[PDB]
């Protein structure tokens, strides 16, 4: 009774693909983001934005295709199809990099949709919404890297382009220009990711190797029942093993699983904060004390100063092709090079 | 020193473009994703055993026989999040997958470094795209190559006397 | 004065002390180089 | 080496303030009636 409740009923019906109110946002945006990417990487060039071939059509492979960022001259234009740049011309829109903002913006709203879905489904089934909470980390990463970062820079041009090799280029740029590996926020990110992968592996292995014998089969998967009340593995034996091997062990399963949420989620959040700084060139580039010493003392050398020489190489060698809007011409004689190479 | 190693390795092996390092990344990104996912799903379905003024962790006692969360609720949520059959209902199968994904990915990472040790390197698409006349049409691979060159020409700036870095 | 019924005891178990101290010390070990610059 | 002359107190307080907070909390938990 009442169109809203009737719509709510239908939206929330238990079907193969749950829809929900969240689905109204999620499905179109996620579909357009994914479809935008497939369309661009298959058919669309980056000749006019980057001087790059970027599609299967031009001869790129899965590793080299991308949907590239718009030209630097576009600034942070939303680049809407009907906007003042493309003026409703679909072909020109593609050539100007309009699919990049298309995918970034639809992708952002799609992510909002997915997290709302996590909330919606949790509420309906009656579980706590920790999965949604955990998803805040992918969201912080996407927003900081694909939105905040280029927004602090000159234009969308310097956002990551959506492609395998293009993303690799983004990594190397961050090394050469930002010294991003030196950043403690990135370091915490690394710790959360590697620590998360570690926890994933060690927990999976531990459960699988402290299983109770609940069947006669040598393949042990059958001997589990979804409705069984009993733990399928021995927490007590697991605890003794790790206490004796490593010195400490989990004793509390709830803490264990919360910690598995905490580690990679916190790591990703920390890396996002660092990238927000990088939006402004607020880098962890240098140690001042190192530079003062090195400048005065030509025999003082550390791995820190060695890496800056690599960075200087990266900037000078990659900049003219990577930043074509700058029209860099670096005569051969000014290029930094060690002996012979 | 680690970062140094990594940057030189990229210059000399184009490791980013190597499928074993790519499997490594899927392994560790995937490991962290599944870590967060599993953690969140079990946490989401903890059976109420405590009041609001205490930590939920006191609802589990070390060595108790019964499971501390409702796996049916957990599965009912995740199955609806994606679709019923993308969700594990067998906890043994789930925990095997948690073990296997990062472990296999990281074995490949290790084999990446261990085979690039014998100079079978990442994919090289340098100048792979050429126009009708023969002009090189750069791709993102060519931009990667410029960054790699910068690393190559600068590293160990006093060590090389001859034109090719052969080890 | 009539007592406040909203008061609660606070707790930190030993494991949480050890986890917390680890966090703080490792963060210090990480950030100290940047503080000295 | 020409280090930041506030690095020492920054690091000391960074360690000591939250460590002390935790020690206070731990010890007063132990002293509670069992």
């Amino acid at each position: 009774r009442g169109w809203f409740d009737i719509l709510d009923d239908w939206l929330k019906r238990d079907r193969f693909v749950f829809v929900g109110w969240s689905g109204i946002l999620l499905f179109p945006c996620a579909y357009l983001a994914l479809g935008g990417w497939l369309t661009g990487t298959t058919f669309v060039t980056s000749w006019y934005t980057h001087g790059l071939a970027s599609s299967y059509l031009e001869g790129c492979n899965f590793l080299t295709v991308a949907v590239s960022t718009p030209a630097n001259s576009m600034g942070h234009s939303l680049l809407l199809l009907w906007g003042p740049e493309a003026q409703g011309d679909f072909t020109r829109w593609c050539q100007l990099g309009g699919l990049w903002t298309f995918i970034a913006l639809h992708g952002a709203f799609g992510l909002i949709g997915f997290m709302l879905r996590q909330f919606e489904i949790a509420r309906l089934v009656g579980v706590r919404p920790y999965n949604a909470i955990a998803f805040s980390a992918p969201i912080a990463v996407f927003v900081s890297v694909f939105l905040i970062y280029p927004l602090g820079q000159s234009s969308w041009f310097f956002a990551p382009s959506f492609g395998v090799a293009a993303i690799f280029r983004f990594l190397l740029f961050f090394q050469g220009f930002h010294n991003w590996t030196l950043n403690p926020f990135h370091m915490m990110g690394v710790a959360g990711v590697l620590g998360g992968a570690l926890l994933c592996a060690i927990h999976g292995a531990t459960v699988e190797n402290t299983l109770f014998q609940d069947g006669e089969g040598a393949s042990t998967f059958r001997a589990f029942n979804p409705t069984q009340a009993e733990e399928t593995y021995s927490m007590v034996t697991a605890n003794r093993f790790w206490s004796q091997i490593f010195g400490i062990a989990f004793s509390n399963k709830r803490w264990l699983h919360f910690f598995m949420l905490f580690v990679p989620v916190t790591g990703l959040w920390m890396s996002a904060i660092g990238v927000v700084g990088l939006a402004l060139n607020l880098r962890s580039y240098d140690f001042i004390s190192q530079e003062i010493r090195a400048a005065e003392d030509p025999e003082f050398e550390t791995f820190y100063t060695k890496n800056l020489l690599l960075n200087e190489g990266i900037r000078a060698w990659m900049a003219p092709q990577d930043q074509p809007h700058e029209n860099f011409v670096f005569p051969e004689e000014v290029l930094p090079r060690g002996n012979a190479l | 020193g680690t970062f140094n190693f990594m940057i030189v390795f990229q210059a000399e092996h184009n490791i980013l473009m190597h499928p074993f390092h790519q499997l490594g990344v899927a392994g560790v990104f995937g490991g962290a994703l599944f870590c967060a996912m599993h953690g969140s799903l079990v946490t989401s379905s903890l059976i109420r055993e405590t009041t609001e003024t205490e930590s939920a962790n006191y609802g589990y006692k070390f060595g108790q026989e019964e499971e501390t969360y409702n796996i049916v609720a957990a599965h009912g949520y995740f199955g609806r999040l994606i679709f019923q059959y993308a969700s594990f209902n067998n906890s043994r199968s789930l925990h095997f997958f948690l073990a296997a994904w990062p472990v296999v990915g990281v074995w490949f990472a290790a084999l990446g470094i261990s085979t690039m040790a014998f100079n079978l390197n990442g994919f090289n698409f340098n100048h792979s795209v050429i126009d009708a006349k023969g002009n090189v049409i750069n791709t993102w691979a060519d931009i990667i190559n410029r960054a790699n060159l910068g690393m190559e020409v600068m590293h160990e700036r006093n060590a090389h006397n001859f034109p090719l870095d052969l080890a | 004065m009539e007592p406040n019924p909203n008061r609660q005891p606070v707790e930190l178990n030993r494991t949480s002390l050890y986890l917390g101290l680890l966090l703080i010390l490792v963060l210090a070990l990480l950030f100290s180089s940047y503080f000295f610059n | 080496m020409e280090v930041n002359q506030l690095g020492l107190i920054a690091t000391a307080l960074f360690v000591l303030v939250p460590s002390v907070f935790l020690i206070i909390l731990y010890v007063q938990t132990e002293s509670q009636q069992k």
Partner: peptide
């Protein structure tokens, strides 16, 4: 002082490992 500071923090971390292992709250089966 920097070096003292780094070594101090490291030393405290090692001391923490010792207490965390040998003076942990023992796990108890109820």
């Amino acid at each position: 002082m920097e070096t003292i500071t780094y070594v101090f923090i490291f030393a405290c971390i090692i001391a923490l490992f010792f207490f965390a292992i040998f003076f942990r709250e023992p796990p108890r089966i109820t």
